[PDB]
Symmetry: C5
Subunit: 207 residues, 5 copies
């Protein structure tokens, strides 16, 4: 054992610059974002508002975190306060994200970071048809609040898992389909393009 | 690269004095304030209260932040906790501003600062006529809480985009017009003048 | 001589926020004035009000003073860098929700002005709220832990309209705001605690 | 003046160890606990829940705080963050204590500490009979969460003042009697005894 | 030899709260036991419960140990000075509201006993709550970020009654509480994560 977990964590806390985006060769930090829906708690077809629980699965690389793990543990759990974390925000959120879980990320000796908080949050989106067979399709847009496409690129995750694997069987609602579209948007507010992942939650009230 | 992003951020955090208004020449800090409405969530015509979501687009100059970017990135995102930010408050707010987004501002190498939080907040204003064709006109006044007109001037941005560019299509309400104008008010409390931007939100319930 | 950065640096390095600025063993004179902005919710059954007010607080702290003959004579300072009086409303039934930036204004002679906008609920007399005479809700504000030899609490000068800053859009209207200074000795402690009692006479609009 | 208030507070701030229980001679710290009821805000006889405002009058001795006051002030107010405070909890509380008042205690030059926060808190207790002449009797148990009887002893106080001395005349309810009594309980979780003060609030809806 | 001041000073100076106390590359054995205190609100339509429980948590951290042959063998330490397991209820729909002082008990051999009283809301099976058989609500608690080689989670051996500490004033009553140990592999992740599944069998009182 070259570096034990105490040495690894000590090195990360002393030298991780949480305010510094881990950019490489002036390429954007590639952030992967995938929502795994856990619950749909409250739906209002009149106001077009949903209250939803989801895992915001977030991965990226930060090579300033890397260590030689040939004779050491190759992974540690790190408080996010000690790490740079992408400034992701859901564009159509109408409440502050309530993080339900310990605020720790997993860091791998090659600098990959995985962070997957469970968030409860309310959204403004299309709720029409929720009580039909076709269901409603609520779209959630997540992207960097302040980093444009040359600094943060945002891409949807890789595909092997079912959409309902994590979803509560006790919810009043059921998931029909979940698709993760990718957008690069240039707005009037700002000259640069901002990338987002658009998650389409097709869901319906159980019969 | 002369200064990479780590160097820029290091220099800012070591020398930015967040308590210190960046007044130059004994001229006021010119603060630009523009509200971009995102949603109108709840309206009560009996109590004259609205619950609204808006981007509080705030720009100002802080020369102590400037760096030589001839061979360096000319922009970085910085936690507002490392910067002086204007002490702006909505005068007719009846709840604490709920900041929905990451608390980062964008700083340009010439010292210009761009801070645009998405805020949910409740306001006491005129809701009468909300369910008519003319609609209601809700006025929100935003100014510095403690800096008078010789220290902070407050001005509405030049208005280029439509008032609904970022407004939710799923809101029960629609925006008819938004106008911004500045005031300089002497109050009886204090002998100086305090500047504000008055935002008039003309809106109505959809038919 | 001193720019704002120097003044704020000096204050931040030498202001002792835990230390009451008593001088000659006289009480710190704290002026308290409530300016009502809104009355949000009223319940005549439970005798509870929800209100928005500016808690205008002034006092002197000479350890803050600087020579301003060739310098700015005022700066805004985070209250975290300043001693602030431990004032509490005796009949509050919620924590004070401070709506505004936590900054005070400090003048070069050491006079501090702190005026947070606060939303807070109170237990008080709501009876008669829907009559012409209105209800009279009394709010008592005093130092939680400093007795009259350490903090004296005085109502400021009433100079303006009592509805000067009151919302025209409130369901309610203000008939009169009066501010008075009581001097009480309670069964807890052989010494005296000062408070300002604010009487808010208000009614539902017709 | 030998030590002014600045010197006293400086000395306390520098040497008070707020994480260290002030045992002497391996005797328990004697903590006095007395509730003074200010208001009864909400009562539910169906759920057996009450919402109450009370002063939690707490006194104890901490000799590491003492100073020579022969020529100095014999009392100061001190942020509780600079003092050790007893880890008291109400056993049947169903909400976190909402502390309404500034978080300062009073310290006397002999090391006697008095801390009296005004607390709003909800309780699970017997609400039956609330709307009868006999009234309801709601019992609240307060003791140390983690210190057993050899480390903290908890005792009530003396009935100098009436039970409704500070109780709101504007409450929907009235206090008939308060009794505060000492308990020492050995539970099954833990081989030690934990002391508590059990406050019995006899109260009724006004007629 | 060491008074409580010395013990706490040594812990505060050397306890590394971000460092998991793995030994010989064996997992930290974390014991988890829920003691239900109250069931506050139940909704059979939404399948949601609001519950108060003691989250009794124990583990060993030998970097906390001290020689207690002539010293106190136990102290209470703020959790902020200790490593605590990153436990999370998988079906919680609200943040855990910790009702109690955030202190743990540390024994001189390095055993930590942390038992917060927690109010939390859960999504689980509420059907049958108003029948004699009652509802069975299952709550799963495991480490959020540590797999089975780093943290093992096990139900504690508990002689004490299910209702030992449950409120007699609750609208509900407890019929049975079982605890059960799982280990799962999810698609997201190569490794296995351990949890304790607590089955709360409960019903509305008649
Ligand atoms: C990693 O460390 C080991 C020494 O334990 C060494 O064998 C190897 O060279 C290192 N790999 C590098 C430097 O990439
Ligand atoms: C910026 O730096 C360059 C060298 O990188 C220098 O030539 C130029 O004078 C600098 N700008 C200033 C100090 O105005
Ligand atoms: C303030 O500074 C001025 C100018 O330097 C000086 O005349 C005066 O002595 C100072 N005030 C005092 C302490 O008398
Ligand atoms: C307290 O201080 C006075 C002198 O200021 C001294 O006479 C007395 O001895 C001191 N108390 C003791 C015994 O520590
Ligand atoms: C604890 O101290 C005692 C003597 O006070 C000693 O016998 C022993 O070496 C110490 N710790 C161990 C290794 O058990
Ligand atoms: N999980
Ligand atoms: N995870």
């Amino acid at each position: 054992v070259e570096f034990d977990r105490a040495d690894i964590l000590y090195n990360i806390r002393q030298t991780s610059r949480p305010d510094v985006i881990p950019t490489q060769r002036d390429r954007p930090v590639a952030v992967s974002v995938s929502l795994k829906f856990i619950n749909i708690l409250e739906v209002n077809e009149i106001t077009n508002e949903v209250d939803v629980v989801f895992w915001q699965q977030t991965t990226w690389s930060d090579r300033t975190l890397a260590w030689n793990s040939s004779h050491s543990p190759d992974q540690v759990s790190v408080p996010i306060s000690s790490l740079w974390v992408p400034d992701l925000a859901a564009y159509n959120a109408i409440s502050k994200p309530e993080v339900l879980t310990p605020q720790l990320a997993r860091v791998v000796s090659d600098g990959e970071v995985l962070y997957m908080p469970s968030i409860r949050q309310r959204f403004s989106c299309d709720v029409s048809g929720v009580d039909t067979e076709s269901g409603a399709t609520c779209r959630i847009k997540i992207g960097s609040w302040t980093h444009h496409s040359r600094e943060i690129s945002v891409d949807p995750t890789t595909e092997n898992s079912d959409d309902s694997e994590y979803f509560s069987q006790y919810s009043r609602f059921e998931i029909l389909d979940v698709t993760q579209k990718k957008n690069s948007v240039t707005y009037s507010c700002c000259p640069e393009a901002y990338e987002d992942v658009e998650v389409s939650l097709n869901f319906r009230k159980k019969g």
